[PDB]
Every structure is written in structure tokens, then in C-alpha cells.
Amino acid sequence: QDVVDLDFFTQEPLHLVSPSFLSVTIDANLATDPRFLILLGSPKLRTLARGLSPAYLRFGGTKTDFLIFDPKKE
Amino acid sequence: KFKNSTYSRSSVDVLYTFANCSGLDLIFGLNALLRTADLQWNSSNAQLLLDYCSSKGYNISWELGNEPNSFLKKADIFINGSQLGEDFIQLHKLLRKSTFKNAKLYGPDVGQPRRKTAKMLKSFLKAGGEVIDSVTWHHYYLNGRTATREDFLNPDVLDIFISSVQKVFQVVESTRPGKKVWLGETSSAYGGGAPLLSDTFAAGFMWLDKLGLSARMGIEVVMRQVFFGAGNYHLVDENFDPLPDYWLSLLFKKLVGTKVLMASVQGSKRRKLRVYLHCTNTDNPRYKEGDLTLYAINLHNVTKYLRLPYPFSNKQVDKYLLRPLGPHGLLSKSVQLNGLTLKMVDDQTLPPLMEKPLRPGSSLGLPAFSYSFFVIRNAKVAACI
Numbered sequence: 001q002d003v004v005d006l007d008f009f010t011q012e013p014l015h016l017v018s019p020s021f022l023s024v025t026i027d028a029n030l031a032t033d034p035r036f037l038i039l040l041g042s043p044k045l046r047t048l049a050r051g052l053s054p055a056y057l058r059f060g061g062t063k064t065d066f067l068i069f070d071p072k073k074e
Numbered sequence: 075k076f077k078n079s080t081y082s083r084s085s086v087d088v089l090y091t092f093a094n095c096s097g098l099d100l101i102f103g104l105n106a107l108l109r110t111a112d113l114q115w116n117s118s119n120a121q122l123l124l125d126y127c128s129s130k131g132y133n134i135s136w137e138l139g140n141e142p143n144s145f146l147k148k149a150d151i152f153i154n155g156s157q158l159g160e161d162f163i164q165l166h167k168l169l170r171k172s173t174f175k176n177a178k179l180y181g182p183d184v185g186q187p188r189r190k191t192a193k194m195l196k197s198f199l200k201a202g203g204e205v206i207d208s209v210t211w212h213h214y215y216l217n218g219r220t221a222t223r224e225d226f227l228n229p230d231v232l233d234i235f236i237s238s239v240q241k242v243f244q245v246v247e248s249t250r251p252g253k254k255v256w257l258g259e260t261s262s263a264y265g266g267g268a269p270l271l272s273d274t275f276a277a278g279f280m281w282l283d284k285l286g287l288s289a290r291m292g293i294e295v296v297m298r299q300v301f302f303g304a305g306n307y308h309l310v311d312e313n314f315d316p317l318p319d320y321w322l323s324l325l326f327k328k329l330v331g332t333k334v335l336m337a338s339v340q341g342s343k344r345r346k347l348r349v350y351l352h353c354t355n356t357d358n359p360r361y362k363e364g365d366l367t368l369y370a371i372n373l374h375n376v377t378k379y380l381r382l383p384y385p386f387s388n389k390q391v392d393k394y395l396l397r398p399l400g401p402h403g404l405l406s407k408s409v410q411l412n413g414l415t416l417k418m419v420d421d422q423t424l425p426p427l428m429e430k431p432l433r434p435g436s437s438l439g440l441p442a443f444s445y446s447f448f449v450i451r452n453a454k455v456a457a458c459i
């Protein structure tokens with residue numbers, strides 16, 4: 001058969017997702033790229049980013065536990 | 075293989091601005107490996123970060139640790155779930171004393187659950203489950219080095235996810251029932267993704283399937299590795315150009331609403347034909363409460379046609395059919411929406427996504443190894459209002 005029939009359930013929602021259901025991450029290791037600041041400044045990139053608003057942006061990875069804050073660093 | 079690195083106030087600023095200006099809510103993974111003599115988390119580095127963030131007016135959610143089940147293998151240190159929970163409690167206290175005392179806290183970003191990952195999660199939830207706003211765990215299908223193109227198309231593979239989701243819920247429900255569960259990090263393959271696969275049209279089957287099942291099974295938020303970066307699984311390449319999975323992701327956003335319905339095929343066999351159903355996204359001006367969005371994945375080697383339950387069988391439907399731009403077929407990095415190729419207009423300007431309006435009653439064509447969304451207009455489903 002090339003025709004397929006479907007069953008729809010539509011009485012009540014089974015679950016409710018967050019408006020931010022589809023979210024993204026940045027690997028924590030990108031913080032070790034020298035040009036981190038430059039990269040995130042990209043207009044091309046920010047336009048894409050707004051395209052998926054609203055969403056969470058998680059900054060983490062294996063490197064999450066191998067990063068340290070330096071108040072002295074410029 | 076891995077040693078410590080630093081970051082600056084400047085880095086934090088960059089990261090925050092990226093989020094705020096792009097309409098995103100930042101979640102920040104703190105370092106959990108800073109430890110005392112007696113191996114409690116030393117929270118003093120985090121204190122500096124929090125204070126700096128406060129002083130700048132930054133609204134931020136926090137995590138602590140990443141894949142703590144692997145700490146022993148990654149850094150020769152074992153932290154038990156009970157202790158990690160205590161550490162999350164310490165973090166809770168600090169967040170409460172800060173200028174944004176309603177900051178969110180999520181954890182523990184464990185890996186997918188084999189026997190002891192599950193046991194660690196359990197003891198974590200026992201000890202510290204009361205202070206976390208969602209339970210985060212991570213999942214990948216394959217090893218990026220052993221994945222073949224055939225694996226990215228195999229339904230049996232996609233269904234190994236099903237067992238993983240359930241195993242996690244089993245643990246949560248036995249300890250903190252009714253708590254939200256999030257996919258905290260997830261994609262196609264580990265080790266940076268599989269080269270010339272995780273970045274192609276072929277990756278969309280796993281990505282769309284994963285959203286479909288996640289929604290159905292009770293996952294409230296899905297975090298894709300990565301928006302962009304070194305890995306093959308990026309949504310945006312090194313040139314800052316969008317890939318197939320980006321356009322898929324954008325399209326999903328415009329069309330799929332929050333309420334989760336369901337669909338299945340009548341005949342037993344639908345392993346190769348996967349279907350999913352939600353209310354349509356209300357915010358789209360083209361659509362209205364009651365409208366339904368069905369999305370569908372065809373892993374058969376020939377075209378399938380879908381026939382809708384009446385009353386919907388006589389409704390006006392918009393097609394959004396996604397086809398690789400040739401001539402590299404499924405491993406193409408370009409994609410077409412209803413026969414127009416998807417491209418940015420320029421670097422500040424996304425294209426509109428043009429539907430294919432269907433004459434009411436028209437059967438639903440789904441070519442081999444493709445996926446599509448269908449919005450059923452004037453469906454007026456009570457549940458969706």
C-alpha cells in the first residue's frame with residue numbers, strides 16, 4: 001500500500017511543552033578559542049540566533065568543570 | 075587530555091549580550107570540580123562570578139557540573155550523588171543571597187542512564203532534588219567515529235532513545251514525582267559528531283524524531299548541541315551559514331505549538347513512518363486557535379501518502395516539504411522548502427518560509443527519505459483553544 005491511514009487523538013493535550021521547547025547550547029570549550037569575543041559579535045550569527053527566539057542558551061560541556069573565573073583577566 | 079582554563083569578565087559580558095540581544099535565556103554551567111580537603115564543592119570561585127554578575131544586572135540561570143557520572147574517568151575524582159546534592163544546596167543558598175534571589179537552578183546534567191548513572195541520579199534527587207527547578211540529563215545516539223550513513227536512517231536506532239527517556243523518568247518518578255525533566259544536552263553523535271553526516275539533511279531524521287518523541291513523552295525543553303562550534307553537529311557552520319538542521323529548527327518554531335496531541339498509523343508497521351501531532355503555534359498570524367500541526371518522517375525507500383481522519387480529511391492544508399538540494403542527495407548541506415532552496419537573504423535578513431497551499435481534500439505526499447510539516451487550517455480542535 002502507498003496510502004496510510006492515521007489515528008488522531010485530540011480530546012485533551014497529553015503534555016504541554018515550554019515555549020522555549022527547542023533550545024540550543026554552546027560548548028564550554030569555545031571559551032578557549034582566542035577569538036571568542038569576535039565570534040559572538042557576528043551579525044550573521046545573531047540574526048540566526050534571534051530566528052530561534054525564544055530559547056534557552058546553555059553554556060556547558062566537558063569543559064564546564066575545567067573553567068575558572070579570573071577577575072584580573074582582561 | 076583536559077586541564078583548567080580561565081575566562082574574563084569580558085567573556086561573560088560577550089556571552090550575556092549574545093543571549094539578551096538574540097532573545098535567549100542564558101543558562102550557565104559552573105565548575106563543580108573545585109573541591110575542599112573533605113571533598114565538598116569549594117564555592118568561592120562561583121561567589122566571584124555571582125557577585126560580578128549582580129553588579130552588572132545580569133538575569134541568568136545556573137547549572138553545576140557536567141556529566142558528573144564521568145568525573146572519575148575525566149579527572150580521577152569520584153563525587154557521590156548525595157554529596158553533589160549537598161553542593162547544589164550550597165549553590166541554592168548563594169543564589170538566594172544575591173540580588174536576583176529567584177534565579178533558576180538546574181541539574182545534574184548526567185549522561186544517558188546505564189546502571190550507575192541512574193543510581194547517581196537517584197541519590198542526587200533524594201539529597202538535593204528539592205532545590206532544583208528541572209532535572210537535566212543528556213543523550214546521544216552514536217559514536218561519531220563509528221556512525222555510518224545507514225545508522226542515521228535506521229528506525230531501530232531512533233527507538234533506543236525511547237528506552238533512555240523512560241529509564242530517567244522511572245528514576246525521577248520514584249523520588250521527585252511531577253518535577254520537570256529537560257534534555258540538557260543532546261545530539262546525533264558524540265565525539266564532535268560524525269563527519270559529513272551530522273551536518274547534513276540526513277541528520278534531520280534523528281533531530282526531528284527526537285523532538286517528536288520528547289514532546290510526547292513529557293520532556294519540557296530540548297537543548298541541542300550545538301548552535302555553532304567545532305563539532306560536526308553544529309546548526310551553523312564555521313562560515314556562519316545555516317545548515318539543514320537549522321532550517322528545520324527554524325521551521326519547527328514557526329509552526330509547532332506547546333500543546334501535545336498524538337498520531338499513529340493504523341496498520342501495526344509504522345517504524346519507518348513516524349508521525350507527531352501538536353496544536354499549531356498560535357503566534358503565527360496565518361493561523362488561529364484550533365489549527366493542528368502534524369509533522370512526519372518517511373524512512374521508506376518510496377513515496378508514501380497520508381490520509382487524514384475526517385473531519386480533517388476535508389480541510390485546507392499547508393505543506394512544508396523539505397528536500398535536499400542536489401546533487402549530493404541525503405548528504406547535501408543545502409535544503410529546499412517546497413522546491414525553493416533555503417538561504418539567508420543577507421546576513422541580517424532571514425527569508426520568509428513559503429507554504430504550499432493544498433486544495434481541500436488533497437492527499438498528503440511524503441517522498442522517500444524526507445520529512446514534512448502539515449498545518450491543518452480551520453481544524454477548530456477544542457483542546458487547542
Ligand SMILES: O=C(O)[C@@H]1[C@@H](O)[C@H](O)[C@@H](O)c2nc(CCc3ccc(C(F)(F)F)cc3)cn21
Pocket residue numbers: 027060061062063140141185212214259263264265266267305
Ligand atoms: O562528545 C561530545 O560531542 C559532547 C561534548 O562536546 C560535551 O563537552 C559533553 O557535554 C558531552 N558529553 C557526551 C556524552 C558522554 C561522552 C563524553 C565524551 C566522549 C568522548 F570521549 F568521545 F569524547 C564520549 C561520550 C558527549 N559530549
